[PDB]
Amino acid sequence: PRVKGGTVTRKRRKKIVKLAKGYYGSKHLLFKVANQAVMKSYQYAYRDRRQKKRDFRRLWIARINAAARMQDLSYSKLMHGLKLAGIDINRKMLADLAVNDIASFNTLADSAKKALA
Amino acid sequence: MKLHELKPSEGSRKERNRVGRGTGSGNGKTSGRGHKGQKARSGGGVRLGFEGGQLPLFRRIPKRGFTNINRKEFAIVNLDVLNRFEDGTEVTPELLIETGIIRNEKSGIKILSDGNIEKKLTVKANKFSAAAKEAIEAAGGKTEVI
Amino acid sequence: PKMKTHRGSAKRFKRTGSGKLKRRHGFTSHMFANKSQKQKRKLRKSAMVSAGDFKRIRQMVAKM
Amino acid sequence: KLSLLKQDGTNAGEITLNDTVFGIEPNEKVVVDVILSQRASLRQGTHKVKNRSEVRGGGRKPWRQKGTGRARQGSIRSPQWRGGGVVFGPTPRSYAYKLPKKVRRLAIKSILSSKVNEEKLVVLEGLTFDAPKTKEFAAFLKNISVDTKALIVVAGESENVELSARNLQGITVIPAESISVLEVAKHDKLIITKAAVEKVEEVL
RNA sequence: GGUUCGUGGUAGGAGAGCGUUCUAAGGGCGGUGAAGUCAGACCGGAAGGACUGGUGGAGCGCUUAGAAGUGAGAAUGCCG
RNA sequence: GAAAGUUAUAAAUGAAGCGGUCUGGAAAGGCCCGCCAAAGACGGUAACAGCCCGGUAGUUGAAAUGGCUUUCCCUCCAGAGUGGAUCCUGAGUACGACGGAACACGUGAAAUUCCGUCGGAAUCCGGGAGGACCAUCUCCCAAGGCUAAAUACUCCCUAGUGACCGAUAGUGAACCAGUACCGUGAGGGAAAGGUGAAAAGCACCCCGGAAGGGGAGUGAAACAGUUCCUGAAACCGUGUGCCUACAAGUAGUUAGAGCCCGUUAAUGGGUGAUAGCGUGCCUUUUGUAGAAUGAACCGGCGAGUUACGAUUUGUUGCAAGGUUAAGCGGAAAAAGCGGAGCCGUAGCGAAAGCGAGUCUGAAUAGGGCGCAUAAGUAACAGGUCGUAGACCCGAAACCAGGUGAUC
Ligand SMILES: [Mg+2]
Ligand SMILES: [Mg+2]
Ligand SMILES: [Mg+2]
Ligand SMILES: [Mg+2]
Ligand SMILES: [Mg+2]
Ligand SMILES: [Mg+2]
Ligand SMILES: [Mg+2]
Ligand SMILES: [Mg+2]
Ligand SMILES: [Mg+2]
Ligand SMILES: [Mg+2]
Ligand SMILES: [Mg+2]
Ligand SMILES: [Mg+2]
Ligand SMILES: [Mg+2]
Ligand SMILES: [Mg+2]
Ligand SMILES: [Mg+2]
Ligand SMILES: [Mg+2]
Ligand SMILES: [Mg+2]
Ligand SMILES: [Mg+2]
Ligand SMILES: [Mg+2]
Ligand SMILES: [Mg+2]
Ligand SMILES: [Mg+2]
Ligand SMILES: [Mg+2]
Ligand SMILES: [Mg+2]
Ligand SMILES: [Mg+2]
Ligand SMILES: [Mg+2]
Ligand SMILES: [Mg+2]
Ligand SMILES: [Mg+2]
Ligand SMILES: [Mg+2]
Ligand SMILES: [Mg+2]
Ligand SMILES: [Mg+2]
Ligand SMILES: [Mg+2]
Ligand SMILES: [Mg+2]
Ligand SMILES: [Mg+2]
Ligand SMILES: [Mg+2]
Ligand SMILES: [Mg+2]
Ligand SMILES: [Mg+2]
Ligand SMILES: [Mg+2]
Ligand SMILES: [Mg+2]
Ligand SMILES: [Mg+2]
Ligand SMILES: [Mg+2]
Ligand SMILES: [Mg+2]
Ligand SMILES: [Mg+2]
Ligand SMILES: [Mg+2]
Ligand SMILES: [Mg+2]
Ligand SMILES: [Mg+2]
Ligand SMILES: [Mg+2]
Ligand SMILES: [Mg+2]
Ligand SMILES: [Mg+2]
Ligand SMILES: [Mg+2]
Ligand SMILES: [Mg+2]
Ligand SMILES: [Mg+2]
Ligand SMILES: [Mg+2]
Ligand SMILES: [Mg+2]
Ligand SMILES: [Mg+2]
Ligand SMILES: [Mg+2]
Ligand SMILES: [Mg+2]
Ligand SMILES: [Mg+2]
Ligand SMILES: [Mg+2]
Ligand SMILES: [Mg+2]
Ligand SMILES: [Mg+2]
């Protein structure tokens, strides 16, 4: 028997066109450029899902360095003292303390100073 | 079997492989053929024995022999088959042909000497081998050529 | 249509009891003054078709 | 082994069936194979399309090979053209095949024993009608509680049986040498008279 | 159900599946609205599958098998 | 030339529910009750009907013409034996040389048959053939003619069938199709289906020259109004929530304020100032963002298939055995019958032949191939191969029959 290709192609192409909503110009209207746009966006998402962790760690390091230079300490010396004192708090929590609990951050910095000497 | 629960024997039927239907199946663009040769073309290929110009094997060795028009080939019967005819029975070609042990007598019946027999039989046959000769006569039977 | 036997090789090959193919040596026509007696004495026997050639010429003598 | 009824709906004694026919252990894979074989050999296979050599027209090359700026073409009935010929498509062809004889005997043997296993088989001593009357046949089918699709097997008893039962939607009558694997499988119950049972035992 | 070792990949080998049209049996829904079509923020590891609402105005799924004119983004591809 | 019968070409008769009720524009549908059936095929009827209509099963019917089958009529008819003295039994033929062809058979060791050209028999005590030819034997009588059935095909007519198509499909043509159109001509050759159950196809009023509209009316529906069921995408517009005139951008992704909303309710939706990272898809390549190729965009169509053989794997039946083919039978069935044939059970040798062995050889030597150390076969399914166009499109060219000197 004959199998004419109805109802199956449009359903498959419309999903790809719908996935490209918000793209400039005809990238959200035409199947052929929408397909390439969707593929490229998936690849970009896959790569940036790795780059995001590095970006946030760099932000935390910069913030901790800024907060620790006010205690007459580098980021390098402070991290060495914290490792040498036995404290195991990651950069995320240290940046949080630096931003909105500066007294506790100063306490931790004092402990790190004690450990160094 | 209810005709709505037909389950054929497992492993007896497989799914045909369709080539050239997308790259997800591994048989997509070039369809299992490679890139741009004589073997990648429709109807393309060489003969069964072609070697690309080198002399084929069959043409560097000589022909041998002839065929005899009067060639005679006999229907072969060993000895162990004869063990399942009761002793005292006259073994004759028609008995063999209707017993089913001989499908067709090509040019006659010849008795060979594989196995052992131990019962007295008298055998009617077109040809005998010497070993089969003393094998039959050592059990007290006799052999005569038709 | 049923497939045809290569008649040029049905005159050269013989099928043995294990399914292999038996052939003849091929330097035995007309220059016997140029090959020694050991060579001639060994070339007059029969040989076997090798595996590489059998892979190639199976179909041609299928019903031979 | 079985209870023998009558056309009136009552009992008339007992009937024994040959154990080598109605009492073997069914072989389901063989039955499936034979059902597929019998259903595949019922189809006509009268279907065809036209190649690029059978569509009317063609021959002339539509335009030059070079210089015109269009794609190279060779006919107006090529496969990719709008009215062109089909590439492979269907051809008239037969589908029938048969399994070895012993397998085909074992299949009917098994599918006929399975009916006895499921208590779907009814044996009655005789089935006859003075004249064709579908009302009386419906009454008889009401007397013997069936209320479903059934296959009635008969012998040389009454020709009025076949005529007075071809209007009922799920009823089929066969004369005891036409018994089939695919006919038996197609129906639910199986009413067979004594003479038909004797014939079936004789044949196989 | 557990322990150990693994899981980049072109040509290519092997395996398991989704979806389309038709047939057979069982079992269903549909003028209290079928297929199609439009829109959604739902579900599955993928191909994909439901649910709800609008338009439409008469046919269509499900389960187990079987058969194929079986899945298109490209051919200076053919037609609109 | 008649009589009878049958059949083909018009037709007749033909059972049973206006059943109640619900939705609905309309009931054939749902629910609850009845009946017919040798009739539950098919189609129509305001949605899906055995019981509404045409019909169906069954039973009937032919004035007229044709076909067929018998019978009568009509016509026409010698066949056995024994002797076979003597006569007859296909002449420029049968053959042969030379040159060709047909035979599976390419001149070959070339029998058999036919054509052209030359030569040219015997005739029953005779002649031909049995793959050069001779002898023996076996079979048969050329150089005259006729002959049904079994076989091949379908422009047609009747009755049906389909795991055949469904308007880019199926015939080139579902429609005034070999038409319109193109060409001097031979010749090439399209596009184009659907209002509604029923035209009930919009009386009348208003703007306008008209077309076209807004009401009114018919209709279940007019967003069914004469390309009229459904009505996707490209493409063209109107209105608006968020952003945008100091900015260098494969147009996105990750972080993210502000503003606007409220869902298949869940760590939701829309837009996004600013910051980081980021040179399309395909093909072909050692290597392409490539200044190498293809694609304006959207839609439909468009490429490993089938038949018959070979081989290998999986499954099923039987097993030293396995299995039928054509055909008969039948419903385009299923059994049954059909053992002819095929593969296997023994191999070695060029062959005579020998045989669990055999060949080479002077050999009981050695060595090659085999047995010991035995599972095959039928059917189906997957992979690959062969003959077929064989995976799809693409040449320049070749041959055969015709049409052209209106340039
Ligand atoms: Mg269809
Ligand atoms: Mg398509
Ligand atoms: Mg945006
Ligand atoms: Mg890190
Ligand atoms: Mg597969
Ligand atoms: Mg691959
Ligand atoms: Mg591709
Ligand atoms: Mg390529
Ligand atoms: Mg290359
Ligand atoms: Mg290659
Ligand atoms: Mg080709
Ligand atoms: Mg030689
Ligand atoms: Mg041999
Ligand atoms: Mg020599
Ligand atoms: Mg042509
Ligand atoms: Mg041509
Ligand atoms: Mg161009
Ligand atoms: Mg066509
Ligand atoms: Mg991998
Ligand atoms: Mg593969
Ligand atoms: Mg459909
Ligand atoms: Mg809908
Ligand atoms: Mg296709
Ligand atoms: Mg396109
Ligand atoms: Mg165009
Ligand atoms: Mg009536
Ligand atoms: Mg009603
Ligand atoms: Mg309707
Ligand atoms: Mg000659
Ligand atoms: Mg002549
Ligand atoms: Mg002679
Ligand atoms: Mg002969
Ligand atoms: Mg001879
Ligand atoms: Mg004649
Ligand atoms: Mg249409
Ligand atoms: Mg058409
Ligand atoms: Mg004209
Ligand atoms: Mg209409
Ligand atoms: Mg008007
Ligand atoms: Mg509408
Ligand atoms: Mg309608
Ligand atoms: Mg639109
Ligand atoms: Mg500036
Ligand atoms: Mg600005
Ligand atoms: Mg959001
Ligand atoms: Mg490469
Ligand atoms: Mg280069
Ligand atoms: Mg550029
Ligand atoms: Mg190129
Ligand atoms: Mg271009
Ligand atoms: Mg191929
Ligand atoms: Mg087996
Ligand atoms: Mg049969
Ligand atoms: Mg030896
Ligand atoms: Mg196969
Ligand atoms: Mg071509
Ligand atoms: Mg010519
Ligand atoms: Mg001519
Ligand atoms: Mg002229
Ligand atoms: Mg002139």
DSSP state string for C27-62: --SS-TTSS-HHHHHHHTSEEE--HHHHHHHTGGGT
**Is chain C in touch with chain D: ≥3 Cβ pairs within 8 A?**
no
Give the bases of strand E that a protein CB approaches within 7 Å.
11-17, 19-22, 24-26, 36-40, 47-49, 63-73, 75-79
Residues of D near B (Cβ–Cβ under 8 Å) read 28-29, 31-33, 35-36, 111, 114, 185-186
Residue spans of the domains in chain A: they are 1-116
Q: Which of A18, A10, A46 is nearest to A34 (CA)?
A: A18
| Structure tokens given for A32 | 């052929």
Tokens linked to D41: 């050999």
Paired residues of C24 in beta bridges: C46
Among C57, C59, C63, C64, the strongest candidate for a mutation testing the B interface, having the largest count of B CBs within 10 A, is C57
Q: CB within 5 A of ion ligand 2: which residues?
A: A 5
CB burial string B25-43: b at 16+ within 10 A, e below: eebeeeeeeeeeeeeeeee
- What is the enclosing helix (H) or strand (E) of B131? helix B130-137
Closest by Cα among A90, A106, A98 to A57: A90
B143 token code pair: 């052999």
Show Cβ contacts of residue A113 under 8 Å, excluding neighbours closer than 6 positions: A71, A73, A81
Instruction: Report the C-alpha gap between A81 and A68 in whole angstroms.
Output: 12
Tally Cβ neighbours within 10 Å of residue B98: 9
D139 nearest nt, CA–C1': F37
Chain center to CA of D86: 34
Q: What whole-number distance in Å separates Cα of residue D36 and Cα of residue B3?
A: 10
> What's the CA gap between B80 and B100, in Å, rounded?
15
CA distance linking residue D14 with residue D4, whole number of Å: 5
For residue A112, give the 3-state DSSP assignment.
helix
Place of tokens 């790809």: A16
Rounded Cα–Cα distance for residues C13 and C16 (Å): 10
Element spanning A94, H or E = helix A91-100
Q: Distances from the Cα of B62 to the Cαs of C8, C15, C55, in angstroms?
A: 10, 16, 21
Nearest to D7 by CA among D167, D105, D142, D115: D142
Domain layout of chain C by residue ranges: 1-63
3-state SS assignment for residue B125: strand
Question: How far does the CA of residue D32 sit from the closest CA of chain B (Å)?
Answer: 6
DSSP-derived pairing of the beta strands D150-153 and D189-193: parallel
C-alpha distance from residue A37 to each of A48, B143, D80 (Å): 16, 95, 30
Chain D residues close to B12, C-beta within 8 Å: 29
The last residues before gaps in chain B (C-N over 2.5 Å) are none
Distance of CA B5 to the CA centre of its chain: 41
Contact D28 B1 (CB under 8 A): yes
Per-residue DSSP letter, B71: -
Half-sphere exposure for A65 (CA within 13 Å, toward CB): 9
Copy the structure tokens of residue B27: 């048989």
Question: Nearest residue to F306 (CA, C1')?
Answer: D91
End-to-end CA distance of chain D: 19
Rg of chain B over CA atoms, in angstroms? 30
B109 DSSP β-pair partners: B75
Report the SS3 class of residue D72: coil
Residue D48 near residue D88, CB atoms below 8 Å: no
The single-letter DSSP state of residue D95 is -
Asked if D185 and D114 count as a contact pair (C-beta separation under 8 A), the reply is: no
> What are the residues whose beta carbons fall under 8 Å from the beta carbon of B106, sequence distance 6 or more?
B73, B74, B75
CA distance B26 to D123: 60
Please tell me the distance from the alpha carbon of residue D163 to that of residue D145, in angstroms, as a whole number.
Answer: 21
User: How far C12 CA sits from the closest chain B CA (Å)?
Assistant: 5
Q: Report, in ranges, which bases of strand F sit under 7 Å from a protein C-beta.
A: 36-41, 161-173, 178, 188-191, 232-235, 250-255, 270-272, 276-277, 280-285, 297-311, 314-318, 321-325, 331-336, 340-357, 368-371, 378-387, 389-396
For residue B143, give the nearest of B115, B111, B119, B118 by alpha carbon. Answer: B111
CA distance C61 to C14: 10
